[PDB]
Amino acid sequence: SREVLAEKVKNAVNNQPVTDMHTHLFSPNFGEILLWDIDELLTYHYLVAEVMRWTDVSIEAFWAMSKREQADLIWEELFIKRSPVSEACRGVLTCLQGLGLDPATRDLQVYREYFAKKTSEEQVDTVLQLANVSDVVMTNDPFDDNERISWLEGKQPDSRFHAALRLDPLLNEYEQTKHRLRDWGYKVNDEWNEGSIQEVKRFLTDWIERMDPVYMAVSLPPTFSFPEESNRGRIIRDCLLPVAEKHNIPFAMMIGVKKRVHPALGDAGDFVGKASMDGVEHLLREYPNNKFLVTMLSRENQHELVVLARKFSNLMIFGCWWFMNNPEIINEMTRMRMEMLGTSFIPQHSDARVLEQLIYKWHHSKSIIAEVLIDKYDDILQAGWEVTEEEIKRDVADLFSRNFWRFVGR
Amino acid sequence: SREVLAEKVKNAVNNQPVTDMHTHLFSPNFGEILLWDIDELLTYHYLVAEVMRWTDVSIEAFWAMSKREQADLIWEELFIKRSPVSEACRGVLTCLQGLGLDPATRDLQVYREYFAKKTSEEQVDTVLQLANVSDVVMTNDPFDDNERISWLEGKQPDSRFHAALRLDPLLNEYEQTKHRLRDWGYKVNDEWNEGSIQEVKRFLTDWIERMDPVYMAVSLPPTFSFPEESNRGRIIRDCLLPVAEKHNIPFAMMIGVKKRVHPALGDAGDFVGKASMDGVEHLLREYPNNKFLVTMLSRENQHELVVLARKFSNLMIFGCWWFMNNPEIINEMTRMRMEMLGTSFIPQHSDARVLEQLIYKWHHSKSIIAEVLIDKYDDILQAGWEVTEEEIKRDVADLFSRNFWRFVGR
Amino acid sequence: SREVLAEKVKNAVNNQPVTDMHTHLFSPNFGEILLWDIDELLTYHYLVAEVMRWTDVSIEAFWAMSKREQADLIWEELFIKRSPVSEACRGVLTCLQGLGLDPATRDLQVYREYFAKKTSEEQVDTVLQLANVSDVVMTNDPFDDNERISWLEGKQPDSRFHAALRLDPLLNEYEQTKHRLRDWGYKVNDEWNEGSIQEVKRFLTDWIERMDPVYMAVSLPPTFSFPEESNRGRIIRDCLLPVAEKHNIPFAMMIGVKKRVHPALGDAGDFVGKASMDGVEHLLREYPNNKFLVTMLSRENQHELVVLARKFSNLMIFGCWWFMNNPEIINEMTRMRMEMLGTSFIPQHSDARVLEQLIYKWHHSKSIIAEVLIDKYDDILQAGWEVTEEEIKRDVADLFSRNFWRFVGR
Amino acid sequence: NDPFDDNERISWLEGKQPDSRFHAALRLDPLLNEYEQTKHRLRDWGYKVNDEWNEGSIQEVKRFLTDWIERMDPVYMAVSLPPTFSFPEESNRGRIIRDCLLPVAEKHNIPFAMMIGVKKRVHPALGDAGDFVGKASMDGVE
Ligand SMILES: O=C(O)[C@@H](O)C(O)[C@H](O)C(=O)O
Ligand SMILES: O=C(O)[C@@H](O)C(O)[C@H](O)C(=O)O
Ligand SMILES: O=C(O)[C@@H](O)C(O)[C@H](O)C(=O)O
Ligand SMILES: [Cl-]
Ligand SMILES: [Zn+2]
Ligand SMILES: [Zn+2]
Ligand SMILES: [Zn+2]
Ligand SMILES: [Zn+2]
What we know:
This is part of a larger assembly, with four copies of chain A. With 410 residues, chain A is of the alpha/beta class. The first copy, chain A, folds into three domains: 1-34 and 117-140 and 325-410, no CATH class; 35-116, uronate isomerase, domain 2, chain A, CATH 1.10.2020; 141-324, no CATH class. Helices cover 52% and strands 8% of the residues of chain A. Chain A is built from 18 helices and ten strands. Chain A has helices at residues 2-15, 38-42, 45-51, 59-64, 67-80, 87-98, 108-116, 120-131, 145-152, 168-172, 174-183, 194-211, 231-246, 278-286, 302-311, 327-341, 357-381, 389-408, and strands spanning 18-20, 133-137, 161-162, 165-166, 216-220, 251-255, 257-258, 271-272, 292-296, 315-317. In chain A, the strands form three sheets. A five-stranded parallel beta sheet of chain A has the order 4-5-6-9-10. Chains in contact: A-B, A-C, B-C, C-D. At the A-B interface, helix 6, strand 8 and helix 16 of A face helix 15, helix 16, helix 17 and helix 18 of B. The site of one D-arabinaric acid has 8 residues of chain B, from loops. Chain D: GO terms for molecular function: metal ion binding. Chain D: This is BH0493 protein.
């Protein structure tokens, strides 16, 4: 029956240890960059954008408040003055309950008590256990002063944390970044010649050696195109692709983000745009020895992206990114994906910026993926097919963990 | 439980008095422009387009028939020859049943009897009571000869009816409209100079003074862009925006309509197109002291529009407009909206052209919005949150009425 | 009640004989072009694309394998190593069960036994009976050497099979095709003059005379536009349209296919793109005496296509084509269509390349269409409308068969 | 000297050497501007170019150029181009120039002559007198 299947699917999904292949979390020993707290959860930029639609407090005043005050404002405006029904607000409550706290009391002061008596290491153990996350993939930007520090000091991340070499500044801001490269000893010239090419490669190789990243990544605008006689186009073609092939490291492209449409909002000021599939199509076909992990921001790019994955095996689609990370969208995306790709895709990643988010991000997404799995297994069951519990666990393992590790070559 | 919640949500939704912030209805005392009748309901242009896909009667012959004959044809073709399953046909039946008539008999002659013995004022009282609509926002075009009359005669609308200054002819047909402005005493010159600017402002100010509109509005094509060195671009930049800021009146933009692709169909001859978000993005960011009410016609513009609202608080999204006003779409739009905006948006408007439509428009939309509210409240309930009935009524009040009045400054 | 209605709708839908207005099947007497077998089902290009996302076997090696080996590989990779949850894999199982075979045993060798002891004619009788398909519309390309043979030999197709004149080579590859036309006696000149025009018309007329097609068809790219001073634009304008009007034959346009993005994949190497609606809009309005059957490949073209059908009665929308032929999409498309068009559209076609697919294609689509019909009938039932079983059968007959025959003029 | 012209191929294939006052120039219009049609002739001549632009197609096109350079000993390779000429470009012309012509020309130190601006056959019936002209962008040459 469907209910017998349902229980097996839900059990398999809930018990399957998750490999979160894209987050903004950091190994505890890396320091304060690792954000956690009910205060951090409430000041997540997703909620900053949401509170600004309600509060009379200016954005300037908001940025001038302490994190405690910002959190108090957001709690009052989005949870008390109006029901916390949005996905992000729902997420906060899910994290609280998961930690054993009681959302029924709406006692923020009591919730804060829970966090103030623990250490980073302890909360990490707690959260990964609760979220059943075995591996976390970080976003490591060698262009950030704070992050560069731990890496240069020789600090190695926790074994549960993996590095990913983020290259946004290099690919999207070369004109400014080239100068920093020079200061660091990478002799790139004013013009794109053999010298500049080799030094950029040396730069990538040095960080690959230092981080041992599972992949190199970059977020791109709606106008992204390739090939292109631009700094980005040339760097990707002459340096990134060749280096990635040599070390058999996949290239992750997060396409569709239009940066800073509302500067004053900070991290909450980015917009979205539909991109052309031409560049991705070209990269996949012309670089068969390169591997590509892709996720797009526009709802209107989702279906064609699935179709492109049917064309090229060197393409691995992943997650329901940012503005796509909402139940209604996650549901439609996951169903279209399983329908045209079976289980050859990575349904989700958390993109967690605050440690505790791993709880709600995976909880909310797992229940949806579980329902989709139940429908699909049931359809073949009605066709006379018999699926074993072991086959279910196998499929679930591919979706939440094995597809990623298998694609990156680990 | 979910069923206890369901009843509370449905009750709150059904009892919440509605402020319909965009319709094509008129205060009864305004005259015959106020359309009502089972005949008017059946000759709604939405059904004209639908009947032309079935009937062998030429469009010319149709326009030559009396309204009674047109209604008879549409009833026969869309209700008798085929089941009235489309949204618009379903709407007609909902209006009948709501009025106490019986769709089971399919007796159009009997239905007509009900309307012929009442007055405009009486039917208005009846419908607003049935639809539980407390306030109706009109669309008042000072460029229409018939409408200009009541306003110039000094006629004030019923207290339940509010004015909205529609400016399509001014913004999209200035080359022709400028001449009428001159005939009315507004000395606009051949070239866009201080004189033309001031006289256009004087024109807007005079009508704002006469109508006391809750907002100024315009429908725009898929190709809409801003800024732009065109009559529209210049009028918006040099006159509309400044005047709207001074009187703190919001600017409503209904984007995506491609006018007259099938001229012979009349009001049923408009098409749709996806628009670029650039112009809206620019307006929101560069005019922070101006308020904007926006609704778009293309299904492919919906998600990005929600994201843009997360960026700018001077943007208030509203309704599921025209071709978007169908269950399947209303559902997906409302869910995406609540998920990314919580309750900071106006889910719907009727766009009613015929008085009785208020019944089905709100009935059909309320049941969908109610189901979405139930899902979202249930999700936070499962997270341990407890929502009171008063909080539900508060949220419902914001969605169906308070968000609008609060945004316009009333 | 809804369950009483449900049974009537499901019964009507299941019993309604289907006219499949677009397939890639052939009358049995046409020869081996008629594909059938569990081996053919498994080597369907939809599954080739899917297996290439999993298998380590090179595409070259795959094309070098025998059909038996290809089928074995696909069965092992997509059904045994991972659960066959994708739509195409689900389809294979549905066909097996429908034929009386047992998917529970996963015994491919036993399944093969069933097919090896029957004749084409026998399997055709079997499948059409099982799929309850009364009429099959073929895709007949006079430019294919193999197909041209039966037609030139004077072979007439089975009475259950209808011809459709496919013109892709003529319209999209005229520069190469013109030479073949000359070799066949059609004196087209180097330049587009009266001579070339008349000879192209003569060519179309000759094949219309030989095939007696229900319609002429062509698949078009995302960049399709009209009018256009190109071979395609000129051929459509000066030859196709005039000839189609004269014989009152509709023109079918399948828009949105980007051919060969992955050449090595063969038939599995096509991609998709969103098209502009301008060309279709122009054709519908400027050629009122011509009939057009249209289906588009991009998910983002679906809603506007429905709106365009509301504008022009000479437009008949049909099916959920190729990448659109997935439950999640079929559901949303069918609901948007019924909501804005009632029953004036053709919900589906199979596009079957392998005989047995008629079973799963129609089985999977019928259950979805049935659920949509049940919702819509229920909505008007709740409005007080009473629908008779005969009206249901009538509506179902229009959707699955009469709308097509009525539109083509048969 | 157009190796794609039947009449012209003869003398070269027969081993005929031109008068000492006459020098050869390898004209490549058919190769660069009509590859889709020309590729088939290359195949018939033994140059195994594939359907897709890969190492194989590249090497065989180079072999073709090298063979004729060897046979003609041209002072330069030449081509006439349309007003819309651009470079780089993901087209047959753009790829052939980038992956074959330029490399081969550098190796043998042979210059590349480009005669830009001709819009072919605007008046077909006039034959050789049917070509028109158009202003080109300097971007590709630059
Ligand atoms: O929080 C987010 O998802 C964004 O602000 C970014 O971190 C984005 O996911 C990125 O990786 O660029
Ligand atoms: O009936 C309609 O919705 C349209 O014909 C128009 O009234 C549109 O809503 C508009 O306001 O321009
Ligand atoms: O199998 C398919 O649907 C495609 O490969 C084509 O046959 C397409 O449907 C077409 O008719 O061009
Ligand atoms: Cl789109
Ligand atoms: Zn991220
Ligand atoms: Zn309106
Ligand atoms: Zn949906
Ligand atoms: Zn087909």
